[PDB]
Ligand SMILES: *Cc1c(COP(=O)(O)O)cnc(C)c1O
């Protein structure tokens with residue numbers, strides 16, 4: 001940076017604080033990652049100065065010749081990476097990606113089937129305080145009370161009874177592989193559309209380490225950030241027959257002018273995802289997640305579903321008589337960043353919780369391998385089993401600093 | 406840039422093309438502007454790596470200490486600049502800013518009164534192909550057929566007959582000052598809320614060159630870009646009593662995690678707007694718009710409302726038997742960027758139009774004064790009155806290059 005330190009010292013000081021914070025702490029929030037320096041440079045570009053209302057070739061304003069190339073590059077790389085027939089890279093967020101699809105297929109008050117929020121489902125999948133649960137009639141399917149894997153018979157039963165117009169699959173906190181083939185099999189039985197929100201698993205789908213939902217779902221939504229390691233934003237993937245309708249749901253549907261500088265960064269992020277080292281990176285993420293899972297059990301922690309198939313894991317803290325809130329607070333004191341998260345059939349409210357959510361996507365970007373996975377797990381054990389001891393927390397504090405150089 | 410040229414040559418080449426395009430052309434689209442190098446650096450920051458779901462102090466995740474400072478700086482500067490009691494700087498766009506307010510005050514199918522789209526109103530003010538016109542029952546008020554100024558008696562008549570729950574004031578293409586006091590007087594009579602969408606005039610409100618809608622409106626929405634010369638995004642301003650409800654309409658209402666790097670740039674943009682030279686800049690914008698308006702009439706062009714009170718003007722092209730589409734196309738050939746725009750009571754469809762929309766915000770940033778306003782107007786006259794002559798267009802092409810160095 002050059003012009004910000006001089007122009008706005010207060011803002012630059014806070015950014016430099018945040019930059020050092022990202023280095024000093026161990027980032028274990030499953031939705032967090034670190035983007036490349038090339039991705040950031042694209043967001044700091046002059047492409048913010050251009051209104052590009054519409055789509056490449058079909059713009060409502062002139063002078064879009066080169067931002068069209070950018071959006072095309074973003075759309076073509078997305079289709080190459082995921083094997084989709086159509087792509088829309090204009091969604092401002094994953095929430096706006098979901099909103100647009102809902103706007104396409106559903107009318108106000110329509111019944112939609114989604115994953116239980118206490119079981120793994122996202123806010124945009126039918127929360128009574130979110131637009132989705134207010135705009136539409138949302139019903140829930142759950143996971144098995146003891147195996148914590150999606151009960152696909154329950155998904156079929158809920159679909160056949162509630163007769164939804166849409167079925168949403170995918171989660172914010174689900175450690176296992178989602179069977180999209182069985183979701184389509186259920187959707188075809190009740191004559192409903194299928195939408196997959198791969199936001200958390202998108203990078204793992206790109207590297208072929210998680211089954212691709214594209215050939216099963218009518219609509220596929222995702223965030224460009226998280227495991228895809230791209231800028232903060234959204235994307236919609238669909239078959240050719242929904243292409244025009246999905247585009248119209250973004251503009252002039254729910255949005256105005258797109259963020260061309262962010263779309264530029266999406267194109268950079270997709271280009272980086274197509275390369276071989278990203279597929280090697282994403283394998284290490286899952287390898288690190290499996291290693292962390294095994295090591296936490298070795299420390300005496302119960303895990304939701306008894307492990308992980310993807311990038312994230314949930315710790316059932318009830319054995320140690322701890323709440324997610326307590327765990328989040330105490331780990332923040334040593335430099336480990338987690339978020340409290342409801343476990344399936346949680347006795348505690350969503351604001352207190354009985355579990356914590358941990359992902360390996362961010363730390364794996366920093367170069368964390370199998371060795372440090374065991375150390376992170378050792379520190380978490382030291383902290384949570386010795387909450388009252390400041391001796392342990394100071395020891396843990398030093399062991400966090402040893403890992404982060 | 407350093408890492409993008411090496412990482413993604415295709416994307417960097419298109420960005421460099423766009424950077425040179427922004428320099429080479431004369432940007433006269435009223436919604437366009439050029440942000441400072443400090444604003445861009447804030448968007449190219451690591452603040453994209455942080456999830457900040459919630460609000461400063463009341464976050465759903467830890468490690469937000471410094472992004473809270475950023476959001477607070479953005480919120481406090483906004484309140485200083487506009488005299489508002491509360492600010493929300495999380496809206497991804499002006500469209501999402503409007504959407505959130507509608508989500509707060511209205512239930513599905515509620516009657517809303519807004520400005521006619523053919524008269525100046527925005528897409529988000531009740532288009533039957535936009536969410537606003539589908540989600541809500543939108544009725545329209547118009548301008549005077551010969552004066553092109555808002556018919557405030559028509560606004561009262563439409564309000565008393567249709568009994569709206571909300572009244573929206575402000576426009577995308579309205580060259581005159583909007584009387585917010587009379588809009589509130591009408592809203593109080595019918596017991597309706599008042600919302601002002603100052604997106605186009607926000608910078609002029611900041612410099613005190615346009616009446617502030619804050620003490621008249623219950624809700625004030627705006628884009629952070631355009632005349633405010635900030636990053637691409639949205640903002641909501643309201644009184645203290647709506648603060649909690651407006652915040653809940655953004656999250657967990659219509660959005661997820663905010664764009665902290667864009668909020669950082671908003672804070673930079675507001676900081677730049679509080680300084681004296683911005684108030685001097687914004688006066689030159691209006692001065693340039695008045696000078697361009699007078700000069701275009703001197704060339705024989707009819708203007709909507711017979712001039713301008715703000716940053717933008719509309720040319721009624723019917724005298725020269727030209728459509729907006731034809732004018733937009735031919736000016737693109739010489740290097741002048743405009744957009745076709747429906748004039749009030751336009752015989753031509755919104756896709757062909759009878760007028761063009763011109764703003765001075767962008768060129769004034771580049772250093773354009775009164776002298777070059779007369780030259781721009783001279784070139785526009787040369788082009789549009791000699792459409793068939795390539796001799797004139799080549800002459801015009803050279804005169805565009807003389808202005809842009
Ligand atoms: C992260 C996520 C989203 C969207 O997040 P934004 O903050 O809106 O980008 C949507 N659905 C799921 C399942 C997610 O994980």
Ligand SMILES: *Cc1c(COP(=O)(O)O)cnc(C)c1O
Nearest residue numbers: 256257498499500527576577604
């Ligand atoms: C520009 C504008 C908006 C929003 O534009 P976005 O592209 O959504 O940022 C909303 N209302 C009015 C009147 C505008 O001019």
